[PDB]
Symmetry: none
Subunit: 78 residues, 10 copies
């Protein structure tokens, strides 16, 4: 179930994005509703450090690929 996917405390972001995109594209949603759902799940899941990282984006991110690129650039190396 896509709506139950959370980014674990120790999980990296690319694994979380892979799992989420997999569960959203392999589901019962229409094809035209996958990108907005993936974006809004990146924003509300993806534990509050990345949540604030996406929130304070000086540019407007309108695509899952752009969000992934931005987060991978500005992520907290740890």
């Amino acid at each position: 179930p896509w709506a139950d996917i959370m980014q674990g405390p120790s999980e990296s972001f690319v694994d979380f994005a892979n799992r989420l995109i997999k569960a959203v594209e392999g589901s019962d949603l229409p094809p035209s509703a996958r990108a907005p759902v993936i974006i809004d799940c990146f924003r509300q899941k993806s534990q509050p450090d990345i949540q604030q990282l996406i929130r304070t984006a000086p540019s407007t991110l309108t695509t899952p690929g752009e969000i992934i690129k931005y987060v991978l650039d500005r992520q907290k190396t740890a």
Copy 2:
């Protein structure tokens, strides 16, 4: 007095913007000097979290409405 308006530690940003725009438009300034003053007061007042949020704007904000929209988008939900 517009030049004495600060955003309180607990005040939201829309209330501060309302108060500031009210005091600036209901003052003795010429009509052509209100927008630059409102912008430069958004930048120097509006306690340092929002100050840094406006400073690190990848786009150039040249209107009080655009600044308000940007800050409302990327504000720290709390």
Copy 3:
């Protein structure tokens, strides 16, 4: 002939926006109610000046301009717009939509004189969509 909206209805709508907010379905219903007859740019501009605060009013001016620009792009994409005419001399400029054209600036009577009913309904629909955008954005 131009007739202004009642300040009593405008005061009631302003208090509705003040207590219920911008996004409540009752507020949108009230706005649709006061958006029933096609309004002149003067009417909608003063209405939004009164019911909205300063910052929402700035946002609404921006959104209204953007929506009117989309309308004018569709109008130059189709010469059969109810605001347009058949010849090129009736093409509608944004100065005529925003009430900035000649013979209209600050004068609602002249505004009502030169404007088309299609112009009025397009302006009204644009203002309603802009209000919806700003309401979704403010909260």
Copy 4:
């Protein structure tokens, strides 16, 4: 006539990407191998769908679009593009490059029919550059020190790996590797390189010299 790539080769390449990663030189060599003949947008799209995960695939779609847009800007900047023609009726739109044009959406046969060989090679080079970008993005040289117990060949391997797999220009890797050999590589080897009667102007020469005169221990 369109012929698909072997699913056996694609499965082997997918397992290579799965074990070695996206950035290994063997993986890039394998991709160059399967990128030998000019592929149709359908082929490259399905290939990246199979070998890449979901998030790298999104990144790759983005990068491929950007590179194709740069190509189309260069094409409108020069009417002699091998994808273009002489008249204005042969100008190539991004719908024709991404396979979105009329008569191409979902049909590889029609795709192969209408596409030009210059179009195919441009699409292929764009996809290769996009793959390189995403591989460099999906996965620090100035923090590398030679450990007290580490040998010198291991330190050199680690340093050259981290310097060549980084964001430096190609013309800045050798001087950086040399100056990192000189300042890292704990003070015994530092003094060994400092007191070199000859001038060492290449990482290979420095490695050879140090391996010759190193303190056997």
Copy 5:
């Protein structure tokens, strides 16, 4: 027309170099096997990039350059080199041997177009001798 070497053979050769080392007679036999057809500078360069580590690859680049320079000295010492021509306009520069000449940098197709078979076999023999030197040097 340029055809790349199989990544399966290259992977097997890389694992051979990884387990047996650089100097084992089986490894040299395998290299001689994959060095059978005359390779373009692109092929040999990528092959050594994949099978050799970073430091042996640097050493091999050095040794390959030195051996190619000896070849070019012998070529300017004899105008009948299978890489050279009869006139002075076919003299082969090191930019053409290392693949750095015009129309060759990064493009294997153009490389295969402009290169001579004598050029290819000379490059190949030079690369083999350089590999032997580096293997004798590494261990």
Copy 6:
């Protein structure tokens, strides 16, 4: 007619070299100032004899000879040198450049008589480059870390100093300074630079950003 340089200016320059050193930018600016008009070999030789100590003077004589030899190789590689002439009888020998030719040894007047303006400017540029070499030689960036208690502007000053006063090419200093800001500069500032919503592509921009958003303490 030959006019000597003022001993007052030479004394001031000598004291500048004595207090600031050979490599300070103020010293190089002063040398460029006193290197404005084309000097005769006698002038530059006596100038370096006075301002430099014995060992730096020996080093400078060596470097000046090497640079003049490179100049003479370029001159025999091009008969259109402003020091050369069109015929072979105007070819310039190193005895004429170093002031050792006939009619010049020890006599500045005869020197100024026979020398060409192109000869003078070539000698002057050679001497300036030799001075730069010796200054870089007479007195490690990859070992610089920001201390736990050190401020960021001090760390940036130290790092930029050590990177610009090193053996790197001029086109490799900015990327190295950036990548050293990112990997050194203890993990608080590392994370501050990492989470930059904008892309910082210049050391000045990175310094400005960090100074804006730094943790006041």
Copy 7:
């Protein structure tokens, strides 16, 4: 003919910047004094290299580039710039302003030869504005 600035004046200005700081009105007056005659890019570059520390010098290089870019935008917006000419062959590129053009890199004499007086005064005003920005930014 190029004449360098006195190292005595430069030393005094450097000590002024060292004791009074970058933002004092006396320091800005001294900079305006040493910014009186139109300087070549070499002069201003070496001056800022000597009087400013490493980090302020980086900031100043950035700011100078930005201001010169604004100048070049205004120049392409008006073909009557005192740095420009009437034909298109006199258009001034940033390589010519920053001293990076052909015949100018590292040579102040050639610089003074090819540069225009309008070019010099524009470079000088740009450098002064950049110094003001960096001084306001540093403290």
Copy 8:
């Protein structure tokens, strides 16, 4: 006196070279005998670490400037 100059245990090499070249050039030697004397004094003075550093020079150093450059390159940083 030039023949009494030794490099002190704590003295740097450039100071020793300066002192030695000063005392040799400001002495009663002919001009054609200063360079060989300076070289042979670099080799026999200049305490045994630098003595061995000059001795094991793969190249032949035939000038005081070249010796100074070599020693400054390969000296023991301390």
Copy 9:
């Protein structure tokens, strides 16, 4: 036996070279194989100080006499 000759810990280098050249020239090797053997025995015998001294030779030594001269020049006086 030439292949059993080592330079003793206290032995000088000229004595070791004399002994080695004697044993190599007074042996059963062909005349054309004595110089390479003498060189390679200088390199592998001749205890590791001289081994490293010969290894770090900026020039290529291709004759026993040249190796002997180089080592005698740069040897550690003791």
Copy 10:
């Protein structure tokens, strides 16, 4: 006609070199004595083979070659060398100086036949200088 040096004198000189060393003034005087008449390459080579040990003999071969090369450079720098002739057909190659030329290898009689007196004295002076160098180098 070639006459060999007395083995008695050679034995006495060898014992002198054995007891006094290579650098004693008495040893150099004795060498000058046995270096009085111009010797053929065979004579000097065998003399140094007998009086010098193996390692000094290698050093002496090196030094003799270097000095002979300097002599041949001076000879190609002056066509009036007592070893040279006027035409180009008498130019003296190092094979003729070291005794390696045709008709000379191993045969002292043929050597004495083809060699010039200037050749002999040049070879002798070269050998003496080489002996001096090696003696100064050995101890």
